[PDB]
Write a protein that binds this ligand. Structure first.
Ligand SMILES: NC(=O)C1=CN([C@@H]2O[C@H](COP(=O)(O)OP(=O)(O)OC[C@H]3O[C@@H](n4cnc5c(N)ncnc54)[C@H](OP(=O)(O)O)[C@@H]3O)[C@@H](O)[C@H]2O)C=CC1
Ligand SMILES: NC(=O)C1=CN([C@@H]2O[C@H](COP(=O)(O)OP(=O)(O)OC[C@H]3O[C@@H](n4cnc5c(N)ncnc54)[C@H](OP(=O)(O)O)[C@@H]3O)[C@@H](O)[C@H]2O)C=CC1
Ligand SMILES: C#CCN(Cc1ccc2[nH]c(N)nc(=O)c2c1)c1ccc(C(=O)N[C@@H](CCC(=O)O)C(=O)O)cc1
Ligand SMILES: C#CCN(Cc1ccc2[nH]c(N)nc(=O)c2c1)c1ccc(C(=O)N[C@@H](CCC(=O)O)C(=O)O)cc1
Ligand SMILES: COc1ncc(-c2cccc(N3CCN(c4cnc(N)nc4N)CC3)c2)cn1
Ligand SMILES: COc1ncc(-c2cccc(N3CCN(c4cnc(N)nc4N)CC3)c2)cn1
Ligand SMILES: O=c1ccn([C@H]2C[C@H](O)[C@@H](COP(=O)(O)O)O2)c(=O)[nH]1
Ligand SMILES: O=c1ccn([C@H]2C[C@H](O)[C@@H](COP(=O)(O)O)O2)c(=O)[nH]1
Lengths: 511, 511
């Protein structure tokens, strides 16, 4: 019973010019070091590698300490490796075998009592040979989210859908997303599947007296998206069937919380492609305090059209609104809170309270202040809006390390559709704000009120929950030097790096 | 050889009156009792042991207790006094009569080994006194009845009776949430005498894996107050030390949640006494839309005075504010959002948005509406306020079964002093609104922004955490018929039933 341990691009690339295709991945190496060494007393592990893999290592690190180094090679001799560097005392001498079947036979003969776990470390020669013989019980895969130029590739295998879109291998473990040198990645493991408390118990047994899960197989679920998935599953399992303003039935839960890290990667959800062009163009729209939805619509972003139609504005009891007008909406309250609205064309400069500018000036001069809030809810002008704000409130926070976090409260949540859009939108705002203030982005926290999935979306969401997440992408702000204030961002100032989602899921917007 | 004791108990240790139970029928208790005495892991059954009067107090259809070996301790009653009392059913075990508890335990070993699984002393005072003296009691199953009743028979005093009320040891290993039957709150505690299948997943868990705990013995944590206790513990252990607008050192955290049930009992926290006279007077102050802190100050609630002083009013740059005037405070926006403020004496009826009216109306008519929100935060009006509202927003949610839930978001949370007050203050509003809208109260959800403990409380809080919580009380609304609007309520229309909190800890208010 052997295990494979690899780092791998989406297109299964592993090496180039007999070296790693990426810049050094410190957290990947630490993870490698730990897996290959650790043991529950008397036994050391074994690291089986090829010649090209052995050679590609730095001289400093070979032989890999505390582990039986076995090199599969015909051309290299057992003494050339011995003459390469003097051996340090306390380690088994590096062993050379003809092929991989012969390599494991060596452990059967001479090391039957000493070795605990067996690890094949590279490369494509030994990996291919390992999967051929099928003696691999487990695969420890580091999924590099970014694509890199490669000439050596890891062989494709049943259930390699965990890398990109297309005896079996099922994921049992998915870690949260890590990053090094602007390279996002995460760790997965895959399985070859094909009376101190006796007194308490009966009190618990009677105490209960009273269906769907996200990716059942995956038992350790480090990935942060699991929040959102388990949140879908929960409302499908434990929510309440409700009616609606829209006329479409709803399953709703009240009081819901999600939080996502910003320090390593960006929570652009992977289980379905997120319309990022939308979250970007809409956020810049908000920041401008723009209330004209045509400016969005023309850019290819049609998210607001149905709620600013001639038909909808009349039902929303505003016959004197122009098509495209969202009223004094999200962005208007941010940049001009309380100001007298006229139309989308009127210039509202200097009028009202610019919450966004004050939130920054507070962050930049006095970050411990507890009044760093931006609201979109104005009970005075709710009726003048074409549709009341969902994401209505957000608070900011700085710690010791000059790291920035952001809470956002949402009154009403279309989990299937709006939520992943909302996560990504505000997390982006945190990145923007953090940069302008000279702070590290840390964490984004999502507070939810009415949290609901629409009944017509339910079939599509079970489809989404069969999908195990991919590593998060990195969002980079570009022209970091050129942008100094929050209004200096443009659409081209951003870069989504290594975003490899699952295929598009179609979901109708509830009018 | 070891025995378990199973009792229900008044805070004053009372167990009986007039050879019967002191309280009305508690179904959930009798359920607990039935299951705990009966449930057994094959060829095996449980023994129940009682006094003569316990046997007599018990209704005829229930004695002897089915599926359990009954033993009555008596010297007047004989074994044939009981056999003639009711024909024995086929299969059941005969009731045995011993003259003392040592004889009872002796009989159990002498004749009933290999026969009886577990031994339960069931009552009354005499046998509970006897069992505690012998030191044979391994576990105490206490049903803490929170309400004080007329009692002539009492459970004996024991080391560890600090779980009942204020003052070889008996410490809690289990505390459940508060239940209620017939206007009576209660909860269940258990006390203890002290004086590569999945292992291939575990190596990656090694490196990823890594001080103050409250009531650490309590292995089961049903009691919803544990949420708050652990929230204090987390802030201290895992928080970051910030400086403060007041100057006093702060340990703080961002984005933490709590939720409390309102269908069984009231989350008026028990681990320290909460100033309920304040929570009631402050809320009815808000409801009236009052901005005059002297109306609270004259009534014995001085919670706002340190913030309406001439010094603080001038430090907030408001020279013309009279002493007492909070400016457009929380009460003000609730009923007059956007109204132009003058002083506390000016009459504002009709001006601004009456959010509270709109909330109740939307509730009583269109409960599936998601715009059912109230907000104290008014960016344009913040400057004129003596203090920017801490609790700034609440949302209401109505269920399938006409069940009301409420979320409240609080930007800044004094976890030592303000948080339990706020839990109490909105749970009360939720009760009030529910009655006024003809709805069953279900849940209060607390969303928290800057969640912090002051450093001149750290010592005073570590002490509090040593205290395990008592059952929650019931808050009843008196004069239900007379009250039909939210303004109809007065301080007298309420009654806190079964409140048994721990001693007061002195915590100064930060100005
Ligand atoms: N991403 C990752 O996790 C890792 C990537 N790498 C990368 O992989 C590349 C090196 O791997 P690769 O190019 O595939 O070369 P290999 O590491 O597979 O080694 C090739 C040589 O080893 C011998 N060999 C290998 N497999 C067998 C076998 N089954 N039977 C007999 N002999 C065998 C052969 O010798 P002969 O010709 O004499 O038969 C062959 O020439 C480098 O670019 C390196 O950076 C390396 C380690 C980890
Ligand atoms: N809430 C609860 O958990 C429970 C409450 N109760 C309440 O308690 C009351 C009955 O209990 P209580 O009044 O204490 O009476 P008991 O049930 O303790 O029975 C009293 C009789 O039992 C015998 N006896 C008990 N202990 C001893 C001893 N150590 N040595 C010798 N004889 C003993 C004596 O019988 P004799 O005189 O024949 O020798 C005595 O007269 C009822 O009102 C009942 O409702 C009862 C059980 C549980
Ligand atoms: C949230 C928000 C902003 N908005 C505004 C907006 C307004 C009313 C709404 N009403 C309802 N019922 N659900 C919504 O998601 C919604 C969203 C959006 C509107 C539509 C889409 C939409 O049709 N979905 C995108 C997919 C984007 C994604 O991956 O999330 C699409 O493919 O068209 C997204 C966002
Ligand atoms: C929250 C809030 C509203 N308020 C108003 C108010 C105003 C300024 C504040 N400032 C600070 N820093 N913390 C607060 O909790 C606080 C509270 C209160 C203020 C004080 C007390 C107080 O002194 N404690 C109570 C004891 C209550 C308990 O034990 O929990 C007392 O006995 O007076 C209570 C409520
Ligand atoms: C950029 O500098 C650099 N870059 C690389 C090295 C290095 C030094 C020793 C050895 C190696 N490898 C050994 C094996 N590997 C591996 C990494 N992660 C996983 N999950 N599986 C692997 N099988 C990477 C290749 C790499 C030194 N220096
Ligand atoms: C008024 O109706 C009513 N009222 C009372 C009864 C009743 C029926 C069986 C038995 C009894 N006991 C009195 C209460 N006991 C008890 C209850 N909880 C705990 N935790 N420990 C106990 N020792 C034991 C025995 C009471 C029936 N009917
Ligand atoms: O950012 C958004 C915008 C809209 N919605 C969804 C949720 C609601 O179902 C609907 C708005 O309608 P009301 O909540 O106003 O009824 O749009 C979101 O989830 N997020
Ligand atoms: O109802 C209240 C009133 C006050 N505070 C506390 C929290 C903060 O510690 C302090 C307000 O300080 P600023 O957030 O305004 O700085 O008062 C509450 O938690 N709840």
């Amino acid at each position: 019973p052997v295990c494979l341990v690899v780092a791998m691009t989406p297109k299964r690339g592993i090496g180039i010019n007999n070296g790693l295709p990426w810049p050094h991945l410190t957290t990947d190496f630490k993870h490698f070091s730990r897996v290959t060494k650790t043991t529950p007393a008397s036994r050391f592990n074994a690291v089986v590698m090829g010649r090209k893999t052995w050679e590609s290592m730095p001289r400093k690190f070979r032989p890999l300490v505390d582990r039986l180094n076995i090199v599969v090679s015909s051309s290299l001799k057992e003494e050339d490796i011995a003459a390469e560097k003097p051996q340090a005392e306390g380690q088994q001498r590096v062993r050379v075998c003809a092929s991989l079947p012969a390599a494991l036979s060596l452990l059967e003969e001479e090391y039957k009592d000493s070795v605990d776990q067996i690890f094949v470390v590279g490369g494509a020669g030994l990996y291919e040979a390992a999967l051929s013989l099928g003696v691999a019980s487990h695969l420890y895969i580091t999924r590099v989210a970014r694509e890199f130029p490669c000439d050596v590739f890891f062989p494709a295998f049943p259930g390699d859908d965990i890398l990109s879109n297309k005896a079996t291998y099922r994921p049992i473990f998915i870690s949260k997303t890590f990053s090094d040198n602007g390279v996002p990645y995460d760790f997965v493991v895959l399985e070859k599947r094909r009376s101190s408390a006796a007194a308490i118990a009966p009190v618990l047994a009677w105490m209960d007296e009273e269906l769907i899960r996200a990716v059942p197989h995956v038992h350790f679920r480090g990935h942060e998206e699991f929040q959102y998935l388990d949140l879908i599953a929960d409302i499908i399992n434990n929510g309440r069937t409700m009616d609606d303003r829209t006329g479409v039935g709803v399953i709703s839960k009240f009081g819901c919380t999600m939080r996502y890290s910003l320090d390593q990667a960006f929570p652009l959800l992977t289980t379905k492609r997120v319309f990022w062009k939308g979250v970007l163009e809409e956020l810049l729209w908000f920041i401008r305090g723009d209330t004209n939805a045509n400016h969005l619509s023309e850019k290819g972003v049609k998210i607001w059209d149905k709620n600013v139609t001639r038909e909808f504005l009349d039902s929303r009891n505003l016959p004197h609104r122009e098509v495209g007008d969202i009223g004094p909406g999200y962005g208007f309250q941010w940049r001009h809170f309380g100001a007298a609205y006229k139309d989308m064309h009127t210039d509202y400069t200097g009028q009202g309270v610019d919450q966004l500018k004050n939130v920054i000036q507070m962050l930049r001069t006095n970050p411990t202040d507890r009044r760093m809030l931006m609201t979109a809810w104005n009970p005075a002008a709710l009726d003048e809006m074409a549709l009341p704000p969902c994401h209505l409130l957000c608070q900011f926070y700085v710690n010791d390390q000059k790291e920035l976090s952001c809470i956002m409260y949402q009154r009403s949540c279309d989990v299937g559709l709006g939520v992943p859009f909302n996560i990504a939108s505000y997390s982006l705002l945190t990145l923007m704000v953090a940069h302008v203030c000279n702070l590290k982005p840390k964490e984004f926290i999502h507070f939810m009120g009415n949290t609901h999935v629409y009944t017509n979306h339910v079939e599509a969401l079970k489809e989404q929950l069969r999908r195990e997440p991919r590593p998060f992408p990195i969002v980079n702000i570009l022209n970091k030097e050129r942008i100094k204030e929050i209004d200096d961002f443009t659409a081209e100032d951003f870069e989504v790096v290594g975003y490899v989602p699952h295929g598009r899921i179609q979901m109708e917007m509830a009018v």
